[PDB]
Design a protein around this ligand. Structure first.
Ligand SMILES: Nc1ncnc2c1ncn2[C@@H]1O[C@H](COP(=O)(O)OP(=O)(O)OP(=O)(O)O)[C@@H](O)[C@H]1O
Length: 378
């Protein structure tokens, strides 16, 4: 069977396969081309992907996500300590290693970050196999450029326990470059800027490519800025609106909020193609139906400061890399959040009208590149 390319992301994962000179991005059972990096445990089963995310508000303490933030890290890590203050699930310390603790079938169980990730990885593999109509063994999995040997190790391990023969672990910015073919030899040095804004992380990487050899000159970004922060702004906005029209605050009801958030994330995606979207939520609080809508104009101003700040890390990346705007040859958009019009405008304006690389769905770019690489390595 063919080797596949997999993008193991913080919020979503994607799997592609190179076959007949073309790369195919494989959709799941629900028909989505990317699946949530969620795993949920219940009295009767273990849900992975969409099925998992589709019940988080009902099973918050037993629904695991953000495993990418834990992977290859230690419990004593200041990162872990800060992060765990926001997860609805338990993170325990097993001899220095962090472990997620859930209740599965009435019994208490705990897993290592790599095991959780292998569950998502297994879902991608069967998604691929269902499409390919054959077993998938070899694979190329992606990882950020800043991941150290421990993190890369853990990612490789997650692959092995998932029954995948990880041919290689390549960086996400490099995979993106390969997706557009910016790795071909043109007898000259080329500077590429990868602007990656996903569900929860923002990475800016400046690559230098000469003779087919990549060289990450610089990196910058924010580990806690992504599409979810945009959703939060909408949520707080609608919470205030509901409070106005119905004299009722819904902040305390955790389910009402999570349901509202799910509606917002969806309206947000629509807003990337339309100028306004309706929020139709039956019986949000008490028996009160919440029917309303937002416009792109409002959505933009709700996140104005966030969108604008996206340029600071870009300036710094350039600065550290010892380059000027005019020196970067190609700019490729990565991450689902880059589909937002205002982000594209903002970046283009910063690079004085330069054309942005974005013909390939940004949230499928990394997988796409990995699939090509997997093909060459087989
Ligand atoms: N049309 C769209 N407009 C805006 N945001 C979108 C759109 N389509 C998808 N997204 C967003 O993209 C995000 C998911 O991005 P992606 O699939 O690239 O994530 P990822 O690699 O898991 O990201 P990270 O590693 O930062 O979490 C979500 O915040 C989702 O709302």
């Amino acid at each position: 069977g063919p080797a596949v390319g997999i993008n193991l992301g913080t919020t979503y994962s994607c799997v592609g396969v190179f076959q007949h000179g073309k790369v195919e991005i494989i959709a799941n059972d629900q028909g989505n081309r990317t699946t949530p990096s969620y795993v949920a445990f219940t009295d009767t089963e273990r849900l992975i992907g969409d099925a998992a995310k589709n019940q988080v508000a009902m099973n918050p303490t037993n629904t695991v996500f953000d495993a990418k933030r834990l992977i290859g890290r230690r419990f004593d890590d200041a990162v872990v300590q800060s992060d765990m203050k926001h997860w609805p699930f338990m993170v325990v310390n097993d001899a220095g290693r962090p472990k997620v603790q859930v209740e599965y079938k009435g019994e208490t169980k705990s897993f290592y970050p790599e095991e959780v990730s292998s569950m998502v990885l297994t879902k991608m593999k069967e998604i691929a196999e269902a499409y390919l109509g054959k077993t998938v063994t070899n694979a190329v999995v992606t990882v950020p450029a800043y991941f150290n040997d421990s993190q890369r190790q853990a990612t490789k391990d997650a692959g092995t326990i998932a029954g995948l023969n990880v041919l290689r672990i390549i960086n996400e910015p490099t995979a993106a470059a390969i997706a557009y073919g910016l790795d071909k030899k043109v007898g000259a040095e080329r500077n590429v800027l990868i602007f990656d804004l996903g569900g929860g992380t923002f990475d800016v990487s400046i690559l230098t490519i000469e003779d087919g050899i990549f060289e990450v000159k610089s990196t910058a970004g924010d580990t806690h800025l992504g599409g979810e922060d945009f959703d939060n702004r909408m949520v707080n906005h609608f919470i205030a609106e509901f409070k106005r029209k119905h004299k009722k605050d819904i902040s305390e009801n955790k389910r009402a909020v999570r349901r509202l958030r799910t509606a917002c994330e969806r309206a947000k995606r629509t807003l990337s193609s339309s100028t306004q979207a309706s929020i139709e939520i039956d019986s949000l609080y008490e028996g009160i139906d919440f029917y309303t809508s937002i416009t792109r104009a409002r959505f933009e101003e709700l996140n104005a400061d966030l969108f604008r700040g996206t340029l600071d890390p870009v300036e710094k990346a350039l600065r550290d890399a010892k380059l000027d705007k005019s020196q970067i040859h190609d700019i490729v958009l990565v991450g689902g959040s880059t589909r937002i019009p205002k982000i594209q405008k903002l970046l283009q304006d910063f690079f004085n009208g330069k054309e942005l690389n974005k013909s390939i769905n940004p949230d499928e770019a990394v997988a796409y590149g990995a699939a090509v690489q997997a093909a060459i390595l087989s």
